[PDB]
Design an enzyme around this catalytic site. Sequence first.
Site, PDB file in Angstrom:
ATOM      1  N   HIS A  24      -6.657  -0.027   8.104  1.00  0.00           N
ATOM      2  CA  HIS A  24      -5.639   0.499   8.953  1.00  0.00           C
ATOM      3  C   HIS A  24      -5.967   2.113   8.308  1.00  0.00           C
ATOM      4  O   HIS A  24      -6.598   2.229   7.154  1.00  0.00           O
ATOM      5  CB  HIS A  24      -4.071   0.110   7.898  1.00  0.00           C
ATOM      6  CG  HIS A  24      -4.403  -0.965   9.006  1.00  0.00           C
ATOM      7  ND1 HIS A  24      -4.623  -2.646   7.784  1.00  0.00           N
ATOM      8  CD2 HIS A  24      -3.981  -1.899  10.215  1.00  0.00           C
ATOM      9  CE1 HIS A  24      -4.114  -3.677   8.749  1.00  0.00           C
ATOM     10  NE2 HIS A  24      -3.749  -3.213  10.197  1.00  0.00           N
ATOM     11  N   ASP A  54      -3.174   4.103   7.971  1.00  0.00           N
ATOM     12  CA  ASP A  54      -1.988   3.820   7.053  1.00  0.00           C
ATOM     13  C   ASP A  54      -1.827   6.048   6.795  1.00  0.00           C
ATOM     14  O   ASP A  54      -0.853   5.748   5.985  1.00  0.00           O
ATOM     15  CB  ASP A  54      -1.802   3.507   5.604  1.00  0.00           C
ATOM     16  CG  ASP A  54      -2.679   2.420   5.804  1.00  0.00           C
ATOM     17  OD1 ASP A  54      -2.832   2.367   4.386  1.00  0.00           O
ATOM     18  OD2 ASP A  54      -2.127   1.680   6.512  1.00  0.00           O
ATOM     19  N   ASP A  96      -7.443  -6.642   2.491  1.00  0.00           N
ATOM     20  CA  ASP A  96      -7.517  -6.571   4.238  1.00  0.00           C
ATOM     21  C   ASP A  96      -8.429  -5.572   5.068  1.00  0.00           C
ATOM     22  O   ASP A  96      -9.047  -5.360   6.593  1.00  0.00           O
ATOM     23  CB  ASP A  96      -5.894  -6.455   5.106  1.00  0.00           C
ATOM     24  CG  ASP A  96      -5.340  -4.782   5.017  1.00  0.00           C
ATOM     25  OD1 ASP A  96      -6.073  -4.194   5.155  1.00  0.00           O
ATOM     26  OD2 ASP A  96      -4.254  -4.461   5.977  1.00  0.00           O
ATOM     27  N   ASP A 145      -7.614  -1.635  -0.016  1.00  0.00           N
ATOM     28  CA  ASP A 145      -7.081  -2.198   0.969  1.00  0.00           C
ATOM     29  C   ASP A 145      -7.362  -3.660   0.761  1.00  0.00           C
ATOM     30  O   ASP A 145      -8.263  -3.379   1.696  1.00  0.00           O
ATOM     31  CB  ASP A 145      -5.693  -2.021   1.692  1.00  0.00           C
ATOM     32  CG  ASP A 145      -4.638  -2.842   2.657  1.00  0.00           C
ATOM     33  OD1 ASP A 145      -5.527  -4.180   2.304  1.00  0.00           O
ATOM     34  OD2 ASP A 145      -3.645  -2.024   3.763  1.00  0.00           O
ATOM     35  N   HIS A 167       0.816  -1.082   0.200  1.00  0.00           N
ATOM     36  CA  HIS A 167      -0.034   0.165   0.144  1.00  0.00           C
ATOM     37  C   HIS A 167       0.808   1.198   0.292  1.00  0.00           C
ATOM     38  O   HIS A 167       0.193   1.480   0.016  1.00  0.00           O
ATOM     39  CB  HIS A 167      -1.170   0.324   0.703  1.00  0.00           C
ATOM     40  CG  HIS A 167      -2.307   0.492   0.325  1.00  0.00           C
ATOM     41  ND1 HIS A 167      -3.979   0.713   1.485  1.00  0.00           N
ATOM     42  CD2 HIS A 167      -2.596   1.466   0.099  1.00  0.00           C
ATOM     43  CE1 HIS A 167      -4.567   1.478   0.870  1.00  0.00           C
ATOM     44  NE2 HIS A 167      -4.084   1.484   0.051  1.00  0.00           N
ATOM     45  N   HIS A 227       4.335   1.044   3.777  1.00  0.00           N
ATOM     46  CA  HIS A 227       2.812   0.714   3.667  1.00  0.00           C
ATOM     47  C   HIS A 227       1.896   0.835   4.604  1.00  0.00           C
ATOM     48  O   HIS A 227       0.705   1.368   4.565  1.00  0.00           O
ATOM     49  CB  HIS A 227       2.472  -0.726   3.554  1.00  0.00           C
ATOM     50  CG  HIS A 227       2.451  -1.535   4.391  1.00  0.00           C
ATOM     51  ND1 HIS A 227       1.932  -3.099   4.060  1.00  0.00           N
ATOM     52  CD2 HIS A 227       3.094  -1.836   5.633  1.00  0.00           C
ATOM     53  CE1 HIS A 227       1.986  -3.311   5.280  1.00  0.00           C
ATOM     54  NE2 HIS A 227       2.297  -2.868   5.890  1.00  0.00           N
TER      55      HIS A 227
HETATM   56  C1  X8A Z   1      -1.364   0.390  11.786  1.00  0.00           C
HETATM   57  N1  X8A Z   1      -0.331  -0.173  11.973  1.00  0.00           N
HETATM   58  C2  X8A Z   1       0.575  -0.716  11.393  1.00  0.00           C
HETATM   59  C3  X8A Z   1       0.587  -1.947   9.999  1.00  0.00           C
HETATM   60  C4  X8A Z   1      -0.166  -0.998   9.080  1.00  0.00           C
HETATM   61  C5  X8A Z   1      -0.718  -1.713   7.750  1.00  0.00           C
HETATM   62  C6  X8A Z   1      -0.565  -0.662   6.830  1.00  0.00           C
HETATM   63  B1  X8A Z   1      -1.897  -1.142   5.136  1.00  0.00           B
HETATM   64  O1  X8A Z   1      -1.179  -0.982   4.270  1.00  0.00           O
HETATM   65  O2  X8A Z   1      -1.504  -3.021   5.399  1.00  0.00           O
HETATM   66  O3  X8A Z   1      -2.368  -1.336   5.721  1.00  0.00           O
HETATM   67  C7  X8A Z   1       1.786  -1.726  12.006  1.00  0.00           C
HETATM   68  C8  X8A Z   1       1.755  -0.970  13.758  1.00  0.00           C
HETATM   69  N2  X8A Z   1       1.759  -2.071  15.066  1.00  0.00           N
HETATM   70  C9  X8A Z   1       2.021  -3.048  14.809  1.00  0.00           C
HETATM   71  C10 X8A Z   1       1.466  -4.651  16.135  1.00  0.00           C
HETATM   72  C11 X8A Z   1       2.104  -3.481  17.119  1.00  0.00           C
HETATM   73  C12 X8A Z   1       0.918  -2.110  17.411  1.00  0.00           C
HETATM   74  C13 X8A Z   1       1.624  -1.306  16.139  1.00  0.00           C
HETATM   75  C14 X8A Z   1       2.273  -0.329  10.703  1.00  0.00           C
HETATM   76  O4  X8A Z   1       3.207  -0.837  10.547  1.00  0.00           O
HETATM   77  O5  X8A Z   1       1.911   1.478  10.835  1.00  0.00           O
HETATM   78 MN    MN Z   2      -3.324  -0.069   3.764  1.00  0.00          MN
HETATM   79 MN    MN Z   3      -4.255  -2.227   5.990  1.00  0.00          MN
END
Ligand code: X8A
Ligand code: MN
Ligand code: MN
Lengths: 314, 314, 314
Positions: free
Chosen positions: B122, B124, B230, B228, B97, B137
């Site tokens: 998310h 993002d 997801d 996305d 993403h 992403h």
């Molecule tokens: C919610 N934020 C995450 C997930 C990002 C997903 C991007 B996508 O394109 O699939 O939407 C995860 C951050 N968390 C990880 C687990 C512990 C708390 C922080 C991040 O890496 O920033």
């Molecule tokens: Mn995303």
């Molecule tokens: Mn996502």
Amino acid sequence: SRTIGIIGAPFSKGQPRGGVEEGPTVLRKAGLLEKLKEQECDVKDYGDLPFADIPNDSPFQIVKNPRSVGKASEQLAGKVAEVKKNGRISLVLGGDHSLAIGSISGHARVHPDLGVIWVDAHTDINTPLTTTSGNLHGQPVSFLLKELKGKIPDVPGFSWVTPCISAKDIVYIGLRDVDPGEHYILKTLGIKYFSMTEVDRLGIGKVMEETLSYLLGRKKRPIHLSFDVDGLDPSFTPATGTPVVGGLTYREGLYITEEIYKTGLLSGLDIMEVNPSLGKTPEEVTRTVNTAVAITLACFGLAREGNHKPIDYL
Amino acid sequence: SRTIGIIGAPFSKGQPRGGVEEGPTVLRKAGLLEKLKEQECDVKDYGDLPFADIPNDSPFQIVKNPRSVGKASEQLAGKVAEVKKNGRISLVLGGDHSLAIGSISGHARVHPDLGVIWVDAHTDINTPLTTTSGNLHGQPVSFLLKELKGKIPDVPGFSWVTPCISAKDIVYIGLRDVDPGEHYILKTLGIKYFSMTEVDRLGIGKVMEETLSYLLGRKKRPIHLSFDVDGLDPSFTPATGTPVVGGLTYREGLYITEEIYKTGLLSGLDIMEVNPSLGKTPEEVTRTVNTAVAITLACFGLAREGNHKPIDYL
Amino acid sequence: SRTIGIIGAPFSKGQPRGGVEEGPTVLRKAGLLEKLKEQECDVKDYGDLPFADIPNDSPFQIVKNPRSVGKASEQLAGKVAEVKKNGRISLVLGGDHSLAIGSISGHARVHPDLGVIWVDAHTDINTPLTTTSGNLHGQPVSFLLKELKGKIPDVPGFSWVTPCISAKDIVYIGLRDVDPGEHYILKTLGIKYFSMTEVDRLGIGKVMEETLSYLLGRKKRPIHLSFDVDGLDPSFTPATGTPVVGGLTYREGLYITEEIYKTGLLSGLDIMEVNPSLGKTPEEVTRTVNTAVAITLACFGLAREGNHKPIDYL
Ligand SMILES: CN[C@](CCCC[B-](O)(O)O)(CCN1CCCCC1)C(=O)O
Ligand SMILES: [Mn+2]
Ligand SMILES: [Mn+2]
Ligand SMILES: CN[C@](CCCC[B-](O)(O)O)(CCN1CCCCC1)C(=O)O
Ligand SMILES: CN[C@](CCCC[B-](O)(O)O)(CCN1CCCCC1)C(=O)O
Ligand SMILES: [Mn+2]
Ligand SMILES: [Mn+2]
Ligand SMILES: [Mn+2]
Ligand SMILES: [Mn+2]
């Protein structure tokens, strides 16, 4: 800010299947206490209750294990009242749902003006005389309701019970397996309920608006949420003793509890009927405990939209 | 009539897991291009982008692979602007993403007045400074928003970026895993969002009415949908890198996209985060790609009620 | 009080796959008749219809097995009219959906003023000339509609058919796989429909309110419910020949039928397209038959909120 008192209630004799005693244990090992600390919460664990074996406990008519169930609820009522006097939200980890007699009773000793939200596939309002199974986890509400005094026999183990809630002070959400006697009581007493039919009709959004306006419209008061994991569909909580298909979704369960949290009035919480031994696979147990933990965290502030501390993140 | 420009973006370095590069390939082999032709659509395939390996790409603070992500988005922005100048709806097949930085940027060079709908679990919207993972992403929106300039550090690979959208011009649908920093930005900037809580409250019907009235009430303008996979529950799209339970249903996903199609204003589309290698079974990959294809076909006119040509069938 | 006439229709030649003939058998062995007796119902079983083999039955153009389908419906029409003359609600256990030609026709001989509710993923309204498959289970509505006379060819086996319903007297619920010719007829004739898009938009609650007000607003009349199990999602009814994803839930199916029961006007019921041989596992067959039975019981009074006899349970 929220302050919580955790009470384990490893008790199973309100129903036939044994593994519900391990409810507190699997919920704790899922990291429930730590995850509560991760969010806003001051957590004190009051331990698992030691329930003495009462080996001499023959049925009262059809009613099974009455002395065991009664004493367990008597003990739990005492512990809950103790946690409420200390200014904490009681969090009871069950254990079968007969324990609600003790949880609601103890809570009401400190907050007589509580309103109950009961999330369940069942009304649990059979009396010792209407029950066809004799399992006391299908009866706790009948022991609690003032309107039903004189309809409850002198069951051994329950002489200490004083029914502390009026029929007007409870709302059911999630009903889809209601016995004929229970339906009669439901209609006769004019109890507010949202069976799965109503949730389908109105949507969970309107259900919660109506639930909360009904309970809190006149006067703000403490909320007791008695959450039976069988309220949610068995695709989310399969490891439970009396699963019924067509249940509330994971989303609906989190919506209910998010909205309850936001009132600022949650005062008591029961998380009941998790039975890890009834999972057909290891994943079914994990899925059930995970969901129950998620439900609980929502009750104490975890919001799907996100949460943040009162600082400038940028 | 609808005219489409397909751009493959086989790129993975906005996150740790590698198989999202095969997204364009499995979507094409599902017969996406043929199925688009089966319905109303004039389709031109602009190919898969050749992303040079940048082997020298050390983290910027905590941020991983910044030069790789930045150049991939720079390249994609160019291709998207090229397809928009040719009067076609750009369809970007991802890929992770982070590529949204490039997709939305390229789109906005030709249509500066675009509004964004972001369907995702998310937001993002982490900045290079709020992120705790360093995975880009989870950051593309922060690079895009005008209100956040001066909060974004000079990250190597991103000097070409000019933030082209205001906080008022984006709507999120499907949120259920929002980091604390992200929630802060969300609330501070006053961004319109429908987390899963709102979808539960209002129903997807009201969500789309509000989304579209918010974005198109004053003035009709081009829509960019960044989808996305997801965003939908992992029971429908399991083969993805950051699945979160309690998601939008298959039905909700098709409703969102049907309603978007009907505006006649869809101008850009991203189909992101399909990772076939993360399917626990062959069926989980098929189920994920099938759903993503179904979502895409809905964006371009396939309606559940049926479709017909302008002739007399009888 | 409700009085019911059960008619088995072990017939499959309206479509290619054979095992739908066993529909009546697996529904009966699920204890359908006994469970109907358990609740309010006076049940008389009129048996399974003996459908003679017509081995000489070559296609009429593209239309397959026309003489077999036509005679089966002719026979069923006779039996249904016989059960209606006896004052009973006809319950037809199918069998493929081509049998609806016979069920609705027989019903209408006794109650010409009936309104039809058609729960299905499909409109089943192709004519012998618009069909691309030739399977007659996708055509029964076209034979029934008055507005389409002169568009239906003289198909061998169907000379007895007199189209008994107007386009204004039918409502579809659950549509998500509608052929172009069918969509044309749908729009041209102005037929009331709630495809999955409408159910997503409005909620099943509003769908049923609109359905029933549309059909019963002017004048109370008999309801015929033709229930194709493929109306519900294949996660609930997989053992069926033409499953389409994104269907009505178990809850929605029970809501539809609960609301229909409550009108007091259900006069005819078809439970169609259960094919046990197409279950990928023994559980998939059980799940499908269980659901179909549950649907049927709801049509005849079983309510999720509970039921009770007119006595004092306390
Ligand atoms: C919610 N934020 C995450 C997930 C990002 C997903 C991007 B996508 O394109 O699939 O939407 C995860 C951050 N968390 C990880 C687990 C512990 C708390 C922080 C991040 O890496 O920033
Ligand atoms: Mn995303
Ligand atoms: Mn996502
Ligand atoms: C609905 N009533 C039951 C179930 C009680 C569940 C209690 B809980 O805490 O999980 O909600 C079952 C009675 N039926 C058993 C099946 C045949 C009909 C009677 C009972 O034993 O009373
Ligand atoms: C939608 N029409 C079909 C299906 C009929 C289902 C009948 B039922 O009783 O189960 O509802 C299928 C036609 N399509 C087949 C796939 C390619 C396009 C045509 C047909 O054969 O007419
Ligand atoms: Mn229960
Ligand atoms: Mn219970
Ligand atoms: Mn069908
Ligand atoms: Mn059908």
